[PDB]
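Researcher: Let's walk through a ligand-bound prediction step by step. First, I give you the protein sequence. Second, the SMILES string for CQQ. Third, you return the three-dimensional complex as structure tokens. Ready?
Model: Ready.
Researcher: Here are steps one and two:
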Amino acid sequence: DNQFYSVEVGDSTFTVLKRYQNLKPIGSGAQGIVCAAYDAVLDRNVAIKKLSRPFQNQTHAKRAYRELVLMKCVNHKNIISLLNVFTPQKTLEEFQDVYLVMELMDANLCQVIQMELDHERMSYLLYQMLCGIKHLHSAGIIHRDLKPSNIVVKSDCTLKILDFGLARTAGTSFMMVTRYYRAPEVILGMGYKENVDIWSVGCIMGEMVRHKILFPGRDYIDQWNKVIEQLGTPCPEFMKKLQPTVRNYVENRPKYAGLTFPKLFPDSLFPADSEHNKLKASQARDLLSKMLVIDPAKRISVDDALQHPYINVWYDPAEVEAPPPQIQLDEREHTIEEWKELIYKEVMNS
Ligand SMILES: *[C@H](CC(=O)Nc1ccc(C(=O)Nc2cccc(Nc3nccc(-c4cccnc4)n3)c2)cc1)CN(C)C
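Model: Step three, the predicted complex:
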């Protein structure tokens, strides 16, 4: 501990470089302790994340290696970037902790989502989401678990995605707590395509309008009921694309016509008494009717969503058509000891 010092932050021991001062707690759970700090060397505020038990198991180590490699290789304004990475331990043998240093954002989408919406801020947040998701897809990264807690925003309304989800897997399976934003093809295990992340964007948008989670529930069974009660029972063609065992339960459910999108998202939930606000309520509802579609064969793509009148007002080829990032590796299994060495070399060679 020459260039390092210790400090207790939010019931967690932070052994960080002497350049990071005035550490303040900001977040924790379901895996990872985060705090805010001032970088003396850069004269800027940062966010420092201490990884929670990265070598407890192979899933933690695979997810830690994946996140560290992707945060380094990706360089997009709508995806959180890695400013610095360090370990207070001097050797591979002693190595046990990883500290990721990133730009400090003002709030999480979980609180911004609760704000009284204006079409300007709302369309801008969704535009940035679609931009970041487009950039991940270009590199073959299908998130599959996009949620408000995985997204951070700044005072100027600029947005960044924190996570990469299941990333480069193949796929549609997570074993760990918030499943309200997962696409039906993921829930029912049908296989996914790139527009699987569009359902999650639809869920988040619907929530910005309603100020209530669209599809809540104790479990998937309860969650699927909330989907069919509101959007209606899917077409026989979709239920045909299900394998016989889950198909049996889905087809045995009571048939629902589903509430129309005017009834799901009435004008009451939208800014009123202006011609511009009237126009914008129907455009927002129309985009929801294209994103919140059970059948992924009929759901809108990221590219077409960016082309929608509600979003296209922000379209900038410099932000949207940016070059995809290129590249042990990201679908091969290793022992926990082997992930530790892969993780140690990433922290050291940066
Ligand atoms: C909503 C999730 C929920 O329960 N509510 C919630 C609120 C806040 C946070 C949180 O800690 N995020 C947060 C809060 C305050 C400032 C910042 N700024 C920031 N800047 C850069 C990086 C980070 C960061 C990185 C890694 C992990 N966490 C934060 N933060 C951020 C969490 C949860 C549930 N929905 C999923 C419905």
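Researcher: And what stands out?
Model: The beta strands are 4-9, 12-17, 20-28, 33-39, 44-50, 82-86, 99-103, 107-108, 151-153, 159-161. The pocket of CQQ is lined by residues 26-27, 32, 34, 47, 49, 102, 104-105, 107-108, 110-111, 147-149, 152, 162, 178 (CB under 6 Å).
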